[model samples]
Target: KCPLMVKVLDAVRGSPAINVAVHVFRKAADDTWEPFASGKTSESGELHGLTTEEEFVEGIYKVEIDTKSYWKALGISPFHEHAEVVFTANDSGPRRYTIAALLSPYSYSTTAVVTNP
Candidate 1:
């Protein structure tokens, strides 16, 4: 089994707040990806405690976080609108992927990788 965690933060840091939406996907042989799981950030700008599937498969996976709605809620216009993160899982052993992102009206940051057992 494996676990994954994702966190989102606002660039402004003050004033109108921003929210986050996250989606996970697994890669297929055809080079396409399919949805595996989905979650949203809490009011504190964090989404932790994700559980991995018992029968985990190895391959490339992607996590996409939508920040547009968050900006919209604050009546602000964002430039990038979203952030997408892609990573690889090496083996069947348990692993963890942590993704932290910073979103602004024009840019964002993402750090994603495989870790642990």
Candidate 2:
């Protein structure tokens, strides 16, 4: 099975977002999103083995990360809401869909790239 990988880093401090919540959502009919897979980042700020029901299904899927709570747990002020990364799997086979987020207490950025297998 193909895995959905998430890599998060502190933009200012250059550290991984360890043990942060990462959730997956699949868009349903009538344009609603349903909860799919959930996980937490490891010590390296990376999450692995996020293979939800059809990993290569052609549809809109979203990756939402709880960076706000992560920063809050450290007793620091956060600058944004939950970070979201949305992508569609249009082709067949597993997609690496490497979603990387650069995060700081005051700012956040994300990028998504597809790797076919």
Candidate 3:
């Protein structure tokens, strides 16, 4: 679980250059995913500010990366069908966390950890 006022880093990588779009969702009390924020990776395979001031809430959240458009733009078949990163955030007290993800044509990796406070 993470606290509020924390910044999350989102990223993507692919050969021949591909554009990646990220969508963030928060789990509501009804167990439904609510749209929080969205972003796209830069040419350098990186994106910052995946979360917004109002987007970070105490609940389960999900980050989805859509690679179809990227793959189509590169004219290459997507090696990995799709990628989704889900995590929980608990902002009840003083704490900060950093979440990051690495993506490629065939694979992806992610992590969420407490940062120096």
Best-fitting candidate, scored by lDDT: 2
Tell how far residue 21 is off in model 2, in angstroms. 0.2
lDDT, residue 108, model 1: 80
Which tens-of-lDDT digit does each residue in 1-117 have in candidate 2? 245788999876678888999999989888999887889999999888888535546778899999999999988888887899887765575566778998988888898767655
User: Considering TM-score, which of the candidate structures 1 and 2 is the better prediction for this target?
Assistant: 2
Tens digits of per-residue lDDT for model 3 on 19-96?
Answer: 577777888889999898777766654556666445454677777777656666756676775567776665553345
lDDT of each: 0.73, 0.82, 0.59
- The reply for model 3, stretches above 4 Å from the true place, is 1-18, 91-97
Model 1 agreement with the true structure over 1-117: per-residue lDDT tens digits:
237778787878743233477888888878888778787888777676555556346778788888888787878888875788887764766677677787788888787766775
Clashes of each: 1, 0, 0
Better of 1 and 2 by lDDT: 2
> Which regions of candidate 1 are displaced past 4 Å?
14-19, 53-56, 91-93
Worst 10 residues of 1 by lDDT: 11-20
| Backbone clashes (count) for model 3 | 0
